[PDB]
Amino acid sequence: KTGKIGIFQHIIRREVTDEDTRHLSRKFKDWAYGPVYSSLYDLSSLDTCGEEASVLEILVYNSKIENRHEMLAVEPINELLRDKWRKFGAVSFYINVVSYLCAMVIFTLTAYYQPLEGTPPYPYRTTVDYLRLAGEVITLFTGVLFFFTNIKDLFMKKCPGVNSLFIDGSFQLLYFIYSVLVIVSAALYLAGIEAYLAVMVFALVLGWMNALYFTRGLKLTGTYSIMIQKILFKDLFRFLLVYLLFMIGYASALVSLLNPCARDSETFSTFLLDLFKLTIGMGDLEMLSSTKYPVVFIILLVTYIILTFVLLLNMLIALMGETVGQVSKESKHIWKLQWATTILDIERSFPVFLRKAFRSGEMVTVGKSSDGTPDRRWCFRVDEVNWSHWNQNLGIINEDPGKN
Amino acid sequence: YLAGIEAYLAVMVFALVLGWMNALYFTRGLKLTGTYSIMIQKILFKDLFRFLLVYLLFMIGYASALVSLLNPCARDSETFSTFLLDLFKLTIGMGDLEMLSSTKYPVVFIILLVTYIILTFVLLLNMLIALMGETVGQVSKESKHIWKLQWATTILDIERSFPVFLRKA
Amino acid sequence: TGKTCLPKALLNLSNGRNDTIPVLLDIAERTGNMREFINSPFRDIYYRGQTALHIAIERRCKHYVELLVAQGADVHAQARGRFFQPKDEGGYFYFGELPLSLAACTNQPHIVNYLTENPHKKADMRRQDSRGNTVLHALVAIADNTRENTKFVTKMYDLLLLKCARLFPDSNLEAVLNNDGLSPLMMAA
Numbered sequence A: 001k002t003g004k005i006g007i008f009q010h011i012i013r014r015e016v017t018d019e020d021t022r023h024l025s026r027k028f029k030d031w032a033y034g035p036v037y038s039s040l041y042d043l044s045s046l047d048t049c050g051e052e053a054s055v056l057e058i059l060v061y062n063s064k065i066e067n068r069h070e071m072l073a074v075e076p077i078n079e080l081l082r083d084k085w086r087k088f089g090a091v092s093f094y095i096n097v098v099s100y101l102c103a104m105v106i107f108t109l110t111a112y113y114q115p116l117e118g119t120p121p122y123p124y125r126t127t128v129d130y131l132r133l134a135g136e137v138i139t140l141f142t143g144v145l146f147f148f149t150n151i152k153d154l155f156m157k158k159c160p161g162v163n164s165l166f167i168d169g170s171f172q173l174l175y176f177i178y179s180v181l182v183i184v185s186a187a188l189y190l191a192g193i194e195a196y197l198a199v200m201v202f203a204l205v206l207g208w209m210n211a212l213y214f215t216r217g218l219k220l221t222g223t224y225s226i227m228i229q230k231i232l233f234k235d236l237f238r239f240l241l242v243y244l245l246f247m248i249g250y251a252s253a254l255v256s257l258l259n260p261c262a263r264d265s266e267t268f269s270t271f272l273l274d275l276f277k278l279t280i281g282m283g284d285l286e287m288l289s290s291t292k293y294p295v296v297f298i299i300l301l302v303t304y305i306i307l308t309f310v311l312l313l314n315m316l317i318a319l320m321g322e323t324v325g326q327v328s329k330e331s332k333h334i335w336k337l338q339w340a341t342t343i344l345d346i347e348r349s350f351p352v353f354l355r356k357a358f359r360s361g362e363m364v365t366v367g368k369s370s371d372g373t374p375d376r377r378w379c380f381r382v383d384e385v386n387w388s389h390w391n392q393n394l395g396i397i398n399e400d401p402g403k404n
Numbered sequence B: 001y002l003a004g005i006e007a008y009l010a011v012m013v014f015a016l017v018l019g020w021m022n023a024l025y026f027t028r029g030l031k032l033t034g035t036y037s038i039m040i041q042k043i044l045f046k047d048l049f050r051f052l053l054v055y056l057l058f059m060i061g062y063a064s065a066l067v068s069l070l071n072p073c074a075r076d077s078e079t080f081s082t083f084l085l086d087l088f089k090l091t092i093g094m095g096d097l098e099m100l101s102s103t104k105y106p107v108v109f110i111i112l113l114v115t116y117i118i119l120t121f122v123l124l125l126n127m128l129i130a131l132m133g134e135t136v137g138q139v140s141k142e143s144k145h146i147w148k149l150q151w152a153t154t155i156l157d158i159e160r161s162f163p164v165f166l167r168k169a
Numbered sequence C: 001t002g003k004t005c006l007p008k009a010l011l012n013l014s015n016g017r018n019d020t021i022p023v024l025l026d027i028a029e030r031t032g033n034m035r036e037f038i039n040s041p042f043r044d045i046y047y048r049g050q051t052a053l054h055i056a057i058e059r060r061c062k063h064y065v066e067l068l069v070a071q072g073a074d075v076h077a078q079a080r081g082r083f084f085q086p087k088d089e090g091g092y093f094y095f096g097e098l099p100l101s102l103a104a105c106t107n108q109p110h111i112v113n114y115l116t117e118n119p120h121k122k123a124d125m126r127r128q129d130s131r132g133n134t135v136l137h138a139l140v141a142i143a144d145n146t147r148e149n150t151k152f153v154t155k156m157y158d159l160l161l162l163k164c165a166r167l168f169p170d171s172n173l174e175a176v177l178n179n180d181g182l183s184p185l186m187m188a189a
């Protein structure tokens, strides 16, 4: 929880040699046959399905994000997450992506097939229109359930801090907004306020854009979508500042050099847009309109084209230094923090009896305890090959070198 | 063509675009054309279905949303393919903005479309950026290995086609 | 798993003695089976050919390899198990299934210089296992490209290549083919 690698890596890999105290150890040694030995890590607090707090749920959810990507790789945690991915993890994730995309397809057809008319357009009454009602039913079933799944997980776990915004903090806020808008929409639908379809169409533009969650799990397109929130926040709200230090400048300057109707004048809402047309190509320069100083008006205009090409190239190289490859290593790190979140969120939603059916490792008689009873752990096997230290004959548990 | 079917100009012209794209095999004779023609594949097989994944969520997104800001024929409707022309018309600086078409809530149609402008450039920037770090930070040293494997395969394919006594010459 | 008294002794070592072993050979001299007692393989489907000669070379225990060779165990006993299969075929450690091959694979030269050069039964280096791999094919099998592995493999590959040329001058060992057709060079490519 506190982010301390140095003693976390030592406790999780503690191998106490002497015979008197071997029940304190956590990295055992199962068998050996020449240069192949079976290190046998002890899962005792690392993977406890349900009936305990867990070190893996603490590292993924309630840890410190500066060291979180370094602690989820120590000895067993990296293989423990892949063994919880080769199992239930990967398979039950792609069930959700084919279900949520279909949940947005059905939501889309309810927007396109809608007879927008005044009051509630209710009286379905035919073989065509009951598909529109039943689609709206499924729409609200996405509505109330995304509300509950977000909030009941929010206050209880996952620690809604300001630093987890790329570790499913932003999507923690967007799936709330998707459930807000769909509640307001179906309310205004059944009431009678005509603006229901405007409220409905903000759930179209959000939800398909909120389907960008589900690229998490590939690392091909997953780290790509990390750049989507990276560029748009750290570099677009610091370019649109500097770009609007010229658009509140030049545009409020050039229209000052313009006859006040005494095109003529008093269409500044278009005159703001008319300047923007010139910077991308689709301009006319009819805004000249025989003004008072056309020599002055054109050397400010050709200045503004350069400076908005200067800033546009500056945005590009700001996406080279503050952004890319210094960030391309950090997107790899923050992918695994989103990846390990994906396995655990599935594994937290299973019921306990099924969650115990998908355990990792195996129950191993690991040594004679102090009282003389067998020590029955839940160890996890990691095989390893060593060619240099030719003395792999140690406190071996099973003298028969093999997985029977 | 050997049958009576006159649709032998559709399939033929799919062949004619291939057989000139398939002459990029023969860029494998030089190192400085061979390592360039491999990056055209890695930008395609890796970094082009990546973009067309996300860009076909927004075009299956906002575009299917903006057709709901349209009268249901009461152009009028039934022509959603034409609006897919109209959407892409606007973003690449050749639109007209006449595709408003009386728009039951008009100001909604601006703020969603200007979102589609500013968001898809970020993705278009991201094609210039996320590709820059992932590919050429490594592929400038990596694709010269893949070329050497393509160059050695070519030499062993020319030899193997020869007869034995010619190979013994 | 048809272990006998003698493989059980050779699994459980402590400073490499287990002092039962020379005594248990002496009782085996009085009853008399020794070409069946020392040559009793495990009839398991997981260790199917492993004998007491394999375990004594395994546990790095030369002086108890000398006793089992002097009594003549089964030098060239093939350990055709399922554990002794390659990493692709289910098994963990593939060493070419032979006691000279097991001595050359686990960086153990002094048993290699004793199994081939002894008063008793010799381990000739031209023998093939169940799939064709000789003592030089199996040094290519365990040849992970790390720094320490390539140090003794190349040292033991020559030491078996030279020694076959001395004893058998009419045959190069690196012509003897795997049942896939491969040579020890083509298996490395």
Ligand SMILES: CCCCCCCC/C=C/CCCCCCCC(=O)O[C@@H](COC(=O)CCCCCCCCCCCCCCC)COP(=O)([O-])OCC[N+](C)(C)C
Residues within 6 Å of the ligand: A086, A087, A088, A091, A092, A095, A096, A149, A345, A346, A349, A350, A351, A354
């Ligand atoms: C090629 C090599 C690999 C080969 C293939 C792999 C080999 C191994 C594969 C093994 C099988 C596949 C594993 C996944 C099973 C799919 C169902 C599932 O995940 O949960 C289901 C039930 O989840 C619930 O929450 C409903 C609970 C209802 C009561 C309990 C019913 C029994 C469990 C169910 C029936 C028994 C199921 C198991 C039957 C064996 C559906 O819910 P969810 O998906 O959790 O929904 C997401 C929830 N979330 C949004 C909060 C995140």
Ligand SMILES: Cc1c(C(=O)Nc2cccc(C(F)(F)F)c2)cc(-c2ccccc2)n1CCCN1CCOCC1
Residues within 6 Å of the ligand: A093, A095, A096, A099, A100, A103, A141, A142, A149, A150, A153, A168, A171, A172, A173, A175, A213, A342, A345, A346
């Ligand atoms: C939106 C959605 C679904 C989903 O829609 N599943 C579904 C499945 C079947 C039927 C249906 C049907 F049809 F009934 F709607 C729906 C599932 C998930 C999910 C959750 C955890 C891990 C992997 C996927 N996520 C994302 C939720 C993210 N949250 C947690 C914190 O970040 C913000 C909110």
